[PDB]
Amino acid sequence: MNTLEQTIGNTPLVKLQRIGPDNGSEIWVKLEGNNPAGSVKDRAALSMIVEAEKRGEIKPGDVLIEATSGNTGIALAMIAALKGYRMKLLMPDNMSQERRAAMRAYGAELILVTKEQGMEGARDLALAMSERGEGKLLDQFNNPDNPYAHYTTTGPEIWRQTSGRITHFVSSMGTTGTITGVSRFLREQEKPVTIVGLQPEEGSSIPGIRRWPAEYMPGIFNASLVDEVLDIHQNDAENTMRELAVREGIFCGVSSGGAVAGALRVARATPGAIVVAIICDRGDRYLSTGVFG
Ligand X SMILES: *Cc1c(COP(=O)(O)O)cnc(C)c1O
Smallest distance from the beta carbon of 5 to its own copies, in angstroms?
8
Say which entry of ligand X, its own copies, none residue 7 contacts (CB below 5 to 8 A, set by partner kind). its own copies
Query: In this chain, which of 54, 57, 98, 134 binds its own copies, going by CB under 8 A?
Result: 98
Q: Among residue numbers 233 through 262, which ones bind ligand X (CB under 6 A)?
A: 253, 255
User: Is 155 annotated as ligand-binding?
Assistant: no
For the packed helices 254-269 and 234-248, what is the interaxial angle rounded to 10 degrees?
90
Any contact of residue 163 with its own copies (CB under 8 A)? no
Any contact of residue 31 with its own copies (CB under 8 A)? yes
Q: Which distant-in-sequence residues (6+ apart) come within 8 Å of 67 by Cβ?
A: 89, 90, 91, 119, 122, 123, 125, 126
Cβ atoms 275, 267 nearer than 8 A: yes
Considering the complex, state which of residue 63 and residue 229 has its C-beta at the smaller distance from ligand X: 229
Per DSSP, the residues of 57-121 read: S--TT-EEEEE--SHHHHHHHHHHHHHT-EEEEEEES---HHHHHHHHTTTPEEEEE-TTTHHHH
Any contact of residue 199 with ligand X (CB under 6 A)? no
Q: Which distant-in-sequence residues (6+ apart) come within 8 Å of 6 by Cβ?
A: none
Q: Is 4 exposed, middle or buried (0-12, 13-18, 19+ CB in 10 A)?
A: middle
Any contact of residue 39 with ligand X (CB under 6 A)? yes
CB under 8 A: which stretch of 27-35, 55-63, 115-123, 182-190 binds its own copies? 27-35
- Residues of this chain that interact with ligand X (CB under 6 A) are 39-41, 70-71, 172-179, 207-209, 253, 255, 280-281
- Residues of this chain that interact with its own copies (CB under 8 A) are 2-4, 6-7, 12, 14-15, 17, 28, 31, 34, 36-38, 78-83, 97-98, 100-102, 104-107, 242, 245-251, 282-285, 287-288, 292-293
| Residues annotated catalytic, as ranges | 41, 255
